[PDB]
Design a protein around this ligand. Sequence first.
Ligand SMILES: OC[C@H]1O[C@H](O[C@H]2[C@H](O)[C@@H](O)[C@@H](O)O[C@@H]2CO)[C@H](O)[C@@H](O)[C@@H]1O
Ligand SMILES: OC[C@H]1O[C@H](O[C@H]2[C@H](O)[C@@H](O)[C@@H](O)O[C@@H]2CO)[C@H](O)[C@@H](O)[C@@H]1O
Ligand SMILES: [Ca+2]
Ligand SMILES: [Ca+2]
Ligand SMILES: [Ca+2]
Ligand SMILES: [Ca+2]
Ligand SMILES: [Ca+2]
Length: 1052
Amino acid sequence: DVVVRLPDVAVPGEAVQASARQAVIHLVDIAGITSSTPADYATKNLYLWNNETCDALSAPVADWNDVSTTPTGSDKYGPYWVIPLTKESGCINVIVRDGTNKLIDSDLRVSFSDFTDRTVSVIAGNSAVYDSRADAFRAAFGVALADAHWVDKTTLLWPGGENKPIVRLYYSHSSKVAADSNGEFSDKYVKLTPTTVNQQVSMRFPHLASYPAFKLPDDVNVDELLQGETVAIAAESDGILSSATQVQTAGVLDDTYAAAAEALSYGAQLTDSGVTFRVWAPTAQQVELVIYSADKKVIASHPMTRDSASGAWSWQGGSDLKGAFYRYAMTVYHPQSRKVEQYEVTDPYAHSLSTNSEYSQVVDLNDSALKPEGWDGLTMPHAQKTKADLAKMTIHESHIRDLSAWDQTVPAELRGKYLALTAQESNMVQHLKQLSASGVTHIELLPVFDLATVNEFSDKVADIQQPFSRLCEVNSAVKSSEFAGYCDSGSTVEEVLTQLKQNDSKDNPQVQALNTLVAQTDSYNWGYDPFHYTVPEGSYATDPEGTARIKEFRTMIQAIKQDLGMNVIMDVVYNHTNAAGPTDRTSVLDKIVPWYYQRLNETTGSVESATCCSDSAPEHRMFAKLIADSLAVWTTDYKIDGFRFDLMLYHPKAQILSAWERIKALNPDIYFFGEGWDSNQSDRFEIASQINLKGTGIGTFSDRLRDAVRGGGPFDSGDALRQNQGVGSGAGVLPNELTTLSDDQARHLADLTRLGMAGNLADFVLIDKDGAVKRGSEIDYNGAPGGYAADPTEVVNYVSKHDNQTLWDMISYKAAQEADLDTRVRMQAVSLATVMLGQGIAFDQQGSELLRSKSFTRDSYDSGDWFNRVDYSLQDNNYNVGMPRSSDDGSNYDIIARVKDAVATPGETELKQMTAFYQELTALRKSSPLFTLGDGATVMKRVDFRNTGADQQTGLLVMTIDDGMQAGASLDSRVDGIVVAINAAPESRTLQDFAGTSLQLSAIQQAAGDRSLASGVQVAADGSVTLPAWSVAVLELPQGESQGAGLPVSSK
Ligand SMILES: OC[C@H]1O[C@H](O[C@H]2[C@H](O)[C@@H](O)[C@@H](O)O[C@@H]2CO)[C@H](O)[C@@H](O)[C@@H]1O
Ligand SMILES: OC[C@H]1O[C@H](O[C@H]2[C@H](O)[C@@H](O)[C@@H](O)O[C@@H]2CO)[C@H](O)[C@@H](O)[C@@H]1O
Ligand SMILES: [Ca+2]
Ligand SMILES: [Ca+2]
Ligand SMILES: [Ca+2]
Ligand SMILES: [Ca+2]
Ligand SMILES: [Ca+2]
């Protein structure tokens, strides 16, 4: 059993020792064995200086651009320097360079008291100072990276151990493994022997299936090794170390503890007998439950009891702990810092919290005191049982502050709060009530779980409605900025921003300049920054301390369903955490079970950030359980009707489906949907994407109709924003001065739009732009198959969302100069019509009915009340209120300045006009079951299109929905068929397709008179129908005594 040791055999000696009044410094340069000629260390030099601290240097270098401090000499182990000294006592500061750069990113202090010989050595890319070149040398053979994966009880996967004679797994309980003084590894260890990856491991971690496999003895005490640091080391026959790296243990943790741990319940569980606390921490050395008083003083610290089979820790107490604050005191090794950390953490299964989430709190959500009157009997206003039920879903995506921050008719104390929804007299609530009466069925809420990016301590926050003096007191960045002069003015921040507007331009973006500072300490953020997954956000409650927020959240939910008549969908963000590591305030999960809840890079062990932040690992069993347990609470205790999964594509398809199975047992009608783009995680598992979820019943946002109607894509910048016109903005038919879009390209977008109005089904058959018969999957969408769904209920169509530019801002970027204000309002309505009158589920951004603008801001997550403003007093749409954030839209300033003032800014006249158009569309959507068939096969048997092929009139979309004898049963007793005609063009168009068929304009549109989207439409005696420019008409075939012939789908 050779004793692994650092390469001490061929270690460098000492080029030279220091004499009198001189300090020698070595730069050990690992020269390859083939070193045939002394490398050129001519460009090598140091930077000397003797400030207040160290002043032993004798006439140090002055300029930083002085590279004459070249080496005094060199050998086969690097160059060395002989620094003159005035005193052989004290220290000196140096910076090893290779020219102008810093060979070492750090200042070095050569303490003579630490090195009496005053002869040190340094390593390239090292921060420590060694006493000899031999030490620095062996130092370059220490532990690096973490490409070793302990995936199961007896399997280790590690590249660096391939072919190496000696492969072992060393471990230390309380210390960091490393060669001792001598230079040999004397720590305890277990011998590994080459093996082949089994079928089980290959299936669990496909992306590691080709890694060199190593086997561990069956009698190894895994539990003990997982208590401290573990390191994989490789060495030759002589026992010399070739490489040593850290080990990722998520895999073995699941294989050892997951099944037993999955069978238990977690959090502070208050029941009859009392309370039982349980937290999963399989690697912790110790765990104590710390109880705090209301004033946050420690009342007691109880060591918990560890269950060997599960790795969970528990503690049982009396029911008198109800309402108590607590945290878990951890003693655990964290691989990132390579140290046994000691810290207090909140409960990841927390169901209540103190202000700003500093302490978790024991709570019983079933408590009547935490429920509004009549809560238990709260019913779901809209059905979600059958596919036809689901298809009627019409979503209004909203944000707590966007809704009431600016409404003066909402009581001041409730602005930006959950309770604003209960102010029935306010403009905002009355507006939502009317939208509901008109056909909007669901309210989707941006992050209302506990987010981390807003300080819940009110005295640390300042909003634009408050004095500029308050902003200066809570924000030091402002106090040291160019706006500091406003600190002692008597103006509010909003008043200052308003006066800055006149002189604001691309050359002086002063509005966003000030707002960027305001954003750091205000109450605003979308909230895609998870702190705790199963506790409501505290800043949206009137009182963030304790359980109060729970009852207030429920009061809001009740108000929406009972008083507004709409179902509620919650946006969830399980794909990432706000932070990881052993030090960040918001790192919870990664502090309790380090390296388990986060997805890590296979080689470095660093937490990935593809999501934006700290990527989570839903593929790990206990996080999948946390997610499902969390969704169960929101479903049962908060009565949420559906969930929108943020970046669902980063979750395994199997995990999302398993979670749905679990929740359906609680609420059989719950609906799941989310972003199913490409997460690039396919190498690790089958992702929950648009393609993979086909036929599962899980919905996904469709980017097909979205891009075809809006024009362009979410990554466009500069002139591309104007060049890429959409069907909704006149592609081909009303070109602007920059576009080069051909008629063919415009018709391809129309193919995508028609396919989307039919549910974006993979098997739907249509006639494309060239007159060819094509299935939905055959219509191209940037190289990918267009149609991907099995049922229209698996598709969520939309033309505006919180992400990216608003619909109005896109139309402003793309509309031709000659399209006047009135025309642009109709373009917004025409664009929304493709969604509202389509078979897919309808989704829209709060405010599209008010021509909402963000002053061109593309990503407004932290742009505050100013750029996210929605005026329910209907004075304007927030357009032209200053150039957007330069950090993300600066490259768009030129194009913005060019298109911004083309027409006037919408006023009350235009806003009222748009709301009417909007409610007309939603009212039409629900006026007949034909608009929402739900089932794919039924859509294929009843839906067809006219005005298709090479001889089509560009921009005119004509869809027919059959209810005649050839379709089967009559689903609508008032009609034998319906015709949807959208004329997205500046010309009047005449349809001869239904001559002599007795077609009639919908009663709903007739009733709107000249305020209808169909104003001016004429149904002639000869049966022909003429539509004016930018109009929408819904026509119907009145049903007689029996089922008529209807509008049979044409054979293709
Ligand atoms: O604060 C994190 C992150 O939030 C936003 O990004 C979200 C986006 O809004 C969601 O629709 C989805 O794409 O997930 C993203 C990450 O959670 C902001 O857009 C982004 O700037 C910010 O960093
Ligand atoms: O937060 C991620 C990212 O999501 C969206 O981008 C999608 C895009 O919408 C899809 O059409 C397709 O290209 O995949 C993209 C993600 O890879 C948002 O549009 C974007 O703003 C956001 O950053
Ligand atoms: Ca020395
Ligand atoms: Ca919070
Ligand atoms: Ca903010
Ligand atoms: Ca990867
Ligand atoms: Ca009928």
